[PDB]
Design a protein around this ligand. Structure first.
Ligand SMILES: O[C@H]1[C@H](O)[C@@H](O)CN2CC[C@H](O)[C@H]12
Length: 440
């Protein structure tokens, strides 16, 4: 058997825009995901977050599912424009009320809330003022975070400033595949830098307002392997750029990673080091998301291309490489030694079907999760201070530019009826949580 530490936090995760629907209900302002998805051509099948899983109405039911599964922690995000419809200034009590009910319910049911302050749904009003490209967002984000802390910090004690700031910056502002849908490398690197400044300002406000809780930040990570000797530097660059070092080198060491500076120095503000002392504001934990591995080789035509491997893949076409989760956990301890780590997302999209027996037989997803949980266990045996693990996601949901076409839930959602059907993977996970680990 593989038993986890006493009190290890088994969780599930969601994000506001992906599950809630009702984006303009009760005085909410538009987000950049509302306006991005309502722009033709941006999202597969013209899908939007208008209805999603209708969690805005079905939240009590969904939490009852978490409870019934015995899951111990719920990572969810707050929609900024539900709270401050113009991004700064006016606070919307109905927005606070929505999350207050969720928080109180979780606590009543003995489930630990982990709140993601920013999970990509920037108020559209702030995008008009440049959004993450504008240095003043450190102020706007600080003011937003302060509202959350003042209203919820008496009850919520575990906070995450930003979800995947690499994606926010690069996918949103260089690739243009996510909101706000821009393709400018100078903007994208100013967004990187402003994300860090905003994160640090929020941590600073947190220390002034919630003297009893913990705060961290969540990064996407891939397991990059070289296509050979030589290539190994291509791997070094992808790790430094795409993984936690882009942000943790500033936080812990006060500068960007060496190979990021080699590639991107000219795109960063001329005097960006002036902000590094503030960026080093102390954090309580590091959240790592992990899903996939990539074979990487140097390619002269960022000087990196991916090499497709004949490995099992998910419906995203992502290679399944469970040892990657062990690697990234080892590597983060070795590089920055954060006092606590969480796996804040791990999961898989498969072509789920409801069988004639009314069940969803996702053995592929069970196998995926089991292998990664096993590799995480290993890291713990070797001294990584991993305190919890969160499955992405509780529910099938709006998967950004792929729309509803990609199902990551351990619970199936029939969008025609909003019916929830717990998948075999959800039942399997509940048993893992109950046993505090693998093989009964
Ligand atoms: O739905 C998104 C989520 O909002 C992000 O935090 C990153 N994720 C990685 C896998 C899947 O793309 C999931």
């Amino acid at each position: 058997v593989k038993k986890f530490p006493e009190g290890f936090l088994w969780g599930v995760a969601t994000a506001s825009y992906q599950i809630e629907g009702s984006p303009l209900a009760d005085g909410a302002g538009m987000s950049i995901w509302h306006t991005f998805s309502h722009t033709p051509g941006n999202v597969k099948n013209g899908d939007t977050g208008d209805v999603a899983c209708d969690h805005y109405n079905r939240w009590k039911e969904d939490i009852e599912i978490i409870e019934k599964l015995g899951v111990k922690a719920y990572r969810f995000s707050i929609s900024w424009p539900r709270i401050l419809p113009e991004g700064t200034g006016r606070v919307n009590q109905k927005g606070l009320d929505f999350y207050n009910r969720i928080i109180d319910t979780l606590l009543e049911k003995g489930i630990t809330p982990f709140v993601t302050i920013y999970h990509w749904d920037l108020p559209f009003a702030l995008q008009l003022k440049g959004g993450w490209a504008n240095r003043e967002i450190a102020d706007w984000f600080a003011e937003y975070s302060r509202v959350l802390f003042e209203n919820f910090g008496d009850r919520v004690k575990n906070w995450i400033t930003l979800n995947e700031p690499w994606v926010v910056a690069i996918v949103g502002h260089l690739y243009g595949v996510h909101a706000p849908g821009m393709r400018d490398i100078y903007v994208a690197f100013r967004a990187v830098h402003n994300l860090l400044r905003a994160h640090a300002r929020a941590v600073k406000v947190f220390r002034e307002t919630v003297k009893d809780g913990k705060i961290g930040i969540v990064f996407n990570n891939g397991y990059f392997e070289p296509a050979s000797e030589k290539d190994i530097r291509a791997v070094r660059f992808m790790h430094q750029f795409n993984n936690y070092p882009l942000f943790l080198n500033p936080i812990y060491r006060g500068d960007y990673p060496e190979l990021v500076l080699e590639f991107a120095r000219e795109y960063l503000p001329e005097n960006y080091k002036d902000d590094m002392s503030e960026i080093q504001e102390k954090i309580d934990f590091v959240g790592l998301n992990y899903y996939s591995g990539h074979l990487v080789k140097f390619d002269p035509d960022a000087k990196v291309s991916f090499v497709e491997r004949d490995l099992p893949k998910t419906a995203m076409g992502w290679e399944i490489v469970p040892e990657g989760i062990y690697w990234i956990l080892k590597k983060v301890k070795e590089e920055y030694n954060p006092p606590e780590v969480y796996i804040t997302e791990n999961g898989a999209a498969f072509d789920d079907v409801v069988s004639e027996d009314g069940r969803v037989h996702d053995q592929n997803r069970i196998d995926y999760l089991k292998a990664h949980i096993g590799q995480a266990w290993k890291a713990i045996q070797e001294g990584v201070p991993l305190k919890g693990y969160f499955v992405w996601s509780l529910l099938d949901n709006f998967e950004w530019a792929e729309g509803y076409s990609k199902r990551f839930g351990i619970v199936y959602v029939d969008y025609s009826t909003q019916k929830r059907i717990v998948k075999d993977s959800g039942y399997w996970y509940s048993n893992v949580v109950k046993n505090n680990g693998l093989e009964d």
